[PDB]
Design a protein around this ligand. Sequence first.
Ligand SMILES: COc1ccc2c3c(n(CC=C(C)C)c2c1)[C@H](C=C(C)C)N1C(=O)[C@@H]2CCCN2C(=O)[C@]1(O)[C@H]3O
Ligand SMILES: COc1ccc2c3c(n(CC=C(C)C)c2c1)[C@H](C=C(C)C)N1C(=O)[C@@H]2CCCN2C(=O)[C@]1(O)[C@H]3O
Ligand SMILES: O=C(O)CCC(=O)C(=O)O
Ligand SMILES: O=C(O)CCC(=O)C(=O)O
Ligand SMILES: [Fe+2]
Ligand SMILES: [Fe+2]
Ligand SMILES: [Fe+2]
Ligand SMILES: [Fe+2]
Lengths: 284, 284
Amino acid sequence: SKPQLQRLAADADVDRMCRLLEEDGAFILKGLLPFDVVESFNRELDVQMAIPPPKGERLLADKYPPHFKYVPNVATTCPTFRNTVLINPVIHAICEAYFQRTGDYWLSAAFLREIESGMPAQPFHRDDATHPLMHYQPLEAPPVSLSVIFPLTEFTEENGATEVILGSHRWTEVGTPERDQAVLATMDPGDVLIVRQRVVHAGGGNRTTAGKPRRVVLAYFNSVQLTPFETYRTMPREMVESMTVLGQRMLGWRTMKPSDPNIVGINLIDDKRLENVLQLKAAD
Amino acid sequence: KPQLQRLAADADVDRMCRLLEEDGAFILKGLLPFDVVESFNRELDVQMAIPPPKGERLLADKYPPHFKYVPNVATTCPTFRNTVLINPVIHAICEAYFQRTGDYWLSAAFLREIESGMPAQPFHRDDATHPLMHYQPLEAPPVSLSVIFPLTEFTEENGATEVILGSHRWTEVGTPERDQAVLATMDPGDVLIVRQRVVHAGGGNRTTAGKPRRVVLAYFNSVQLTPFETYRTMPREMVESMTVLGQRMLGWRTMKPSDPNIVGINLIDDKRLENVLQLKAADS
Ligand SMILES: COc1ccc2c3c(n(CC=C(C)C)c2c1)[C@H](C=C(C)C)N1C(=O)[C@@H]2CCCN2C(=O)[C@]1(O)[C@H]3O
Ligand SMILES: COc1ccc2c3c(n(CC=C(C)C)c2c1)[C@H](C=C(C)C)N1C(=O)[C@@H]2CCCN2C(=O)[C@]1(O)[C@H]3O
Ligand SMILES: O=C(O)CCC(=O)C(=O)O
Ligand SMILES: O=C(O)CCC(=O)C(=O)O
Ligand SMILES: [Fe+2]
Ligand SMILES: [Fe+2]
Ligand SMILES: [Fe+2]
Ligand SMILES: [Fe+2]
């Protein structure tokens, strides 16, 4: 069939990863997270899936059909995400290389979707739609967003493995593509799918019959020039201070630095660093 | 040589918009009443009497001592927070200008005070806070607007803001000569509005009489862009003393970029930030 997503081992060099992002728009890393990390993350998500459901307004969940179960802002309820996944050194090597031209990056959102048996596919989209200015950024400009997609169960053809349209970052418009234009990110738990800015993709339908839910966590990174979709500003101080410096930087708790010509920074207060005004301690 | 156009405070916003598109800037005459200018100046006097810290100053430490700098004006100046920041003409302009991008908020508000003997500021675009703006096409929805308040007279001799008309049509700032600019000579109560991508600079103060020149920048950005200054450490008591509009400007509420983002930005728990915080407001 069509050209497929390229798979690389977790120890591959970041240069080939970048080449794949520019050429295909996406690639898969095999075996990045160990089994115990996946297990611990799933255990923490199980708790969030089991507490009483939210009542009142749900800004995203109320608007879209009930074709997924949603745990927003997993960093606030899943220590394995904050302490291990969010600070993974390979993910940050990729981010540092990819965001080199734009400067610092941070976490715009990270959430779980759980797709039960019988749910149809998600509409094709670009994650870029969070910040519509990205639609007008030329392809050659410094990228400002990156999607990091973690399978927490197997992703199969039957259960709706993420569908990615390779090369669709070269399109001006998303349009209305057919599902057969995409290829499948079939993966095992512990793998990761990395998707460039402007690449059209979607969760697939779960065609299993009963009781076989697919779990996916998206960690959406943006240039610090872009406002985080999720604000981590209500995290308690003791939780923030239990993170490493890198974790605090990702979650918006520190002053950050866009590329030159901004030599001053962003997310400042009183001409000082946010973490200094707050006297933030950190685990490291 | 074409000069900045001056308009009365009751001019139609459509004329203001035409001037921003053609010239890149215009002046409104007599927007703020005498008592508002006076109280704002007295509030800034309080801050100007505080000696600067000898700790880190992220902006002030990097540039020559050719200005005195008071950041965080929305916190320390109630006349700004309660009156200037919510001015209906300013918001009518912002609503027209930011129509295509969606919601906007306050990225920074600061004072510069320039005493006799200080030379001119380098030419710049305020856009340099968020370098992605350099790559945005001229016809794309604007994402930044500079609102410049004279708190003293601005004259040729005291260093009235210099604006290069039409420079938003240049790709690069380049190295323009001072004589390419025209002067925003103004009296307190006026305002200078400067479009995204327009090259401008404060002038030198060559006088030997009169108060040091005072200028306040209120820098507005699309909510897609991270505020240069964060107001997240403002005490809840002070936040709740503001109107809803003021809270929205200072980053304390969930906001709405344009379609195709139908969910929002600056949210948490899939809910509006102000609902999670149970924020009261002066006009709620
Ligand atoms: C959490 O599960 C979902 C369930 C549905 C959607 C949809 C989109 N996203 C991504 C959201 C992020 C915060 C990364 C979704 C995430 C996504 C929306 C955004 C803000 C990126 N979207 C779209 O962009 C396009 C825009 C036109 C219709 N679209 C959709 O229906 C849709 O796929 C919609 O189903
Ligand atoms: C508050 O007083 C100052 C004193 C100096 C500068 C300079 C710039 N700005 C604007 C800052 C904002 C937060 C709106 C300044 C503001 C401005 C910097 C930024 C981040 C917009 N700048 C520049 O962009 C260019 C970039 C190249 C050299 N430049 C300068 O020296 C300079 O004018 C520099 O003097
Ligand atoms: O469900 C998936 O595999 C992809 C989800 C996704 O792309 C999203 O929610 O932004
Ligand atoms: O000093 C002035 O009149 C202009 C100041 C300015 O443009 C800035 O600091 O961004
Ligand atoms: Fe997505
Ligand atoms: Fe098949
Ligand atoms: Fe400026
Ligand atoms: Fe003179």
